[PDB]
Design a protein around this ligand. Structure first.
Ligand SMILES: OC[C@H]1O[C@@H]2O[C@H]3[C@H](O)[C@@H](O)[C@@H](O[C@H]4[C@H](O)[C@@H](O)[C@@H](O[C@H]5[C@H](O)[C@@H](O)[C@@H](O[C@H]6[C@H](O)[C@@H](O)[C@@H](O[C@H]7[C@H](O)[C@@H](O)[C@@H](O[C@H]1[C@H](O)[C@H]2O)O[C@@H]7CO)O[C@@H]6CO)O[C@@H]5CO)O[C@@H]4CO)O[C@@H]3CO
Length: 214
């Protein structure tokens, strides 16, 4: 009778040294009970995660599996502990099996990409098009300069199709795709679509959750 959860949060010391802030994780398009979030972790950050606020699941729970693909260095005995300071893409997959959930936690490298007509029409992960990564909690990811004109497209890289984890700028805010998108973001609304030309760059700040074309 159980279905996969609709919400995921993360909580811990890289957000609030008091564990009082719960980051709601963005949901992976078209795939149920999978979530992703771009977070800076300090060295020996401690965190847990949960489905609702004030649920605390940690590394020792037998429903839980960790997969490190970022060299974050994940360990701990209750809390999750991330050894190496860095931006990482925190990624959770909750699947039903039996009457309980079964979590897969994956750290992906902080890899953000420009796609689409703004790039001369790359529709695949291509390292010419990867944002540089800021050193601090508060820096920006910045794209390389665009080489053509059109709608801007942006995504993170995972083991899934790119467009399942892509996003844009609505009103200075970072908006993660949550509908069926075919030709353009204007399918959502305008000032969801974001018009670029040769020379432009994006700045993203994922701590704030904002960004801007420049
Ligand atoms: O500020 C105090 C506290 O701050 C930080 O703790 C974090 C913690 O690391 C996070 O995991 C989270 O805690 C969650 C738990 O994850 C969650 O399971 C639940 O915890 C309940 C326990 O399962 C239950 O056994 C009992 O906890 C007891 C605990 O066994 C005792 O040890 C005692 O806790 C004290 C710590 O021992 C002490 O080191 C310090 O904790 C710091 C911690 O170092 C830091 O990382 O103080 C605490 C108590 O103040 O007492 C508790 C019961 O009081 O009951 C808890 C339910 O509370 O819930 C907690 C969140 O409350 O978040 C905390 C920060 O809040």
């Amino acid at each position: 009778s159980l279905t996969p959860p609709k919400t995921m949060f993360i909580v811990g010391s890289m957000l609030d040294t008091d564990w009082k802030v719960w980051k709601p994780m963005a949901g992976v398009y078209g795939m149920d009970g999978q979530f992703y979030s771009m977070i800076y972790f300090d060295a020996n950050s401690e965190f847990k995660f949960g489905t609702k606020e004030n649920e605390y699941i940690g590394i020792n729970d037998n429903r839980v599996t960790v997969t490190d693909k970022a060299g974050a260095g994940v360990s701990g005995s209750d809390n999750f502990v991330v050894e190496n300071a860095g931006w990482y893409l925190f990624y959770v997959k909750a699947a039903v099996k039996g009457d309980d959930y079964q979590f897969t936690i994956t750290f992906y490298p902080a890899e953000v990409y420009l796609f689409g007509n703004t790039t001369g029409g790359s529709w695949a992960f291509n390292d010419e098009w990867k944002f540089t990564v800021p050193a601090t909690k508060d820096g920006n990811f910045v794209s390389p300069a665009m080489t053509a004109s059109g709608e801007v497209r942006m995504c993170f890289k995972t083991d899934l199709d790119w467009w399942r984890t892509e996003f844009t700028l609505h009103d200075g805010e970072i908006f993660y795709r949550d509908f069926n998108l075919i030709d353009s973001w204007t399918e959502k609304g305008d000032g969801y679509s974001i018009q670029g030309s040769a020379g432009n760059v994006i700045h993203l700040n994922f701590t704030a959750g904002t960004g801007e074309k420049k």
